[model samples]
Target: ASLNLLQEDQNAGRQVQMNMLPVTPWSIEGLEFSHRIIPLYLSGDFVDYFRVDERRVAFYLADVSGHGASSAFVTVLLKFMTTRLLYESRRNFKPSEVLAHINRGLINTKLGKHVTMLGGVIDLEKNSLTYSIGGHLPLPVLFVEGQAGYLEGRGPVGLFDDATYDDRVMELPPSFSLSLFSDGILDLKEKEASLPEQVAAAGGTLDGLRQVFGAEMPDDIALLVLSRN
Candidate 1:
């Protein structure tokens, strides 16, 4: 009886965190974004999107070091840090700069937890993507003309006060689909097919990714899909 009660409490706690998320994937002027977060017993994976200016949109995916309650707290802290951009100067809108600020905050504030993240700024007017990575893995994938593969970038954040990140810029293709995944997805796979190939086959919904999660999810899973619509 006691064990069941504890499980119920944990589920309700996860529901609260779910409510704090974007509620649903967002669709803005020229783009469509969608994501799914499946916590492995209180998820450590976090993802979000926001507008920094009329011409720029920001989105990110983060995976903290571990799963469970403490790691879940770090995910919430990351969201709070990103929200600061809403009132800040555009001068600080670059992905690397924003990551630096977050790294520093984690160092100073002492979350006792660190994360691997991928962040990007979409310049609609400029028609380019400016991205940076904080030690994340299985980099973002690009699907253009029905072909899909990875787009490489840096990795892990919040490890050191001066762990710097550099921006990687790529032009947005005339029309293409981009998908980002947490490293956890690698654990939920079979050897016959590659993740990109599966994504292409499933048509790329967060639910498409869920097919890989069988009776047990070894780690938290986060999937972010953005396409020019």
Candidate 2:
């Protein structure tokens, strides 16, 4: 009986998680956004993208330390905190600042959970992107002119009180795609160094990624792709 009840609870949790996510294949201005999430069980992974203001958009992919109910709860807390931060600021905010805020909030909660995340902001007027990393693996892949490469930045959120992050800035190419992934992707492949090449081979689209990764994943997998063409 209790096992059946647990399953019901997880089903409810999954629905709530889905409700909090931004619509897939969302677009604004000339930029297009799309994502996919496959949960091993109730998903410790989460992704979100939203317009920050008239001239800016923000997006992130996060993986809490574990799977199941507790990890899922942290994802909810993450959504709440980030939403509240945007509401309070109502203006431009750095990705590092957002990470710092989440670090503090998680520490205060004492939930004994941590997260690995990658987040960024796009400035439409400037035609540039600024992004930060929180101990996320496989870094973000940048695909342009039929080639792919990885961006650099590091530090994890919600783990240490003194944790700080740095923002890396770059000019957006005329036609390019950026792909973010949780570390779970590492489990499905043989070599990490080959990821950029795979991103290029996949053409940097979520549909292409689906073809590359195929049907089974050992851990929760989340992929977010942003593109301009």
Candidate 3:
């Protein structure tokens, strides 16, 4: 049961997410990784980042199923799993491979059902990206040269282990800025069926997505956006 992100307090969850990230931004020769995390209501939106080496950087976003206690629990799962990946990356390398490894562990954890997700790896030295997913909703949106659009990818992470059967690799461009969101934002609007629709309805801007639902925001909005910085 990889669903450990079930915190009842948005502030507490946000603090945990912040603790998972580097209080000091992670910087490499030509790359920088930073995160802005906020929980709209008590959400399972978890963001975390760490370095594998001088050349490799890994970042992940996970959404725990349901809200309240259950979601917070899943987020904590994300923190530990990702931190473990970084701490022991020498053996469990490769983004997709690490994903598969974690997937197997999650299924064995006895957490029933599913938890959707989207995550990526940025190689600063080689300028490449490795990404994977599991039934998680609201994909990553990349903004480049003032042009904003979604970065397409696959399913969830915890509670299920199916993506190892599929191919989930995406390339990254230097000029691209990316936004990774959870199901909470996707469930915000009544008329928005797809992720693009909801993002557009929320005003279609990074700031828009950041400020859109304020107090009335329904879903657990654990979001992260990045661009070479």
User: What is the C-alpha lDDT profile of model 2 across 1-229, one tens digit per residue?
Assistant: 9999988877888888888998867878988888888884588889988887679888889988867777888898889988898788765467898888889988876588998888888999999899988765668887877777788766656588886678888899888788887766453254756865564545535445554654656678888888889
- TM-score winner: 2
**What is the lDDT of every predicted structure here?**
0.76, 0.79, 0.60
How many backbone clashes does every candidate have? 5, 0, 22
Between prediction 1 and prediction 3, the one with superior TM-score is 1
Of the pair 1 and 2, which is ahead by lDDT?
A: 2
Native RMSD of candidate 2 (Å): 2.7
lDDT of 3 by residue, 164-200 (tens): 5343555667666676766755433535535453454
Question: Which stretches of candidate 3 lie above 4 Å from their native place?
Answer: 1-18, 24-32, 40-42, 89-92, 109-113, 156-158, 161-171, 186-216
Q: Write the per-residue lDDT of candidate 1 for residues 1-229, one digit (tens) a residue.
A: 9999999989987987877778555777767788878774688888898876679889988888878888898888888878865766556657898888888878876767888888888988888898888765567876777677766765547678776678888888877678778866554344523765556535644444445654557788888888874
Cα TM-score per model: 0.86, 0.89, 0.72
State which candidate has the highest lDDT: 2
| All candidates in order of lDDT, best leading | 2, 1, 3
Question: By TM-score, is 1 or 2 better?
Answer: 2
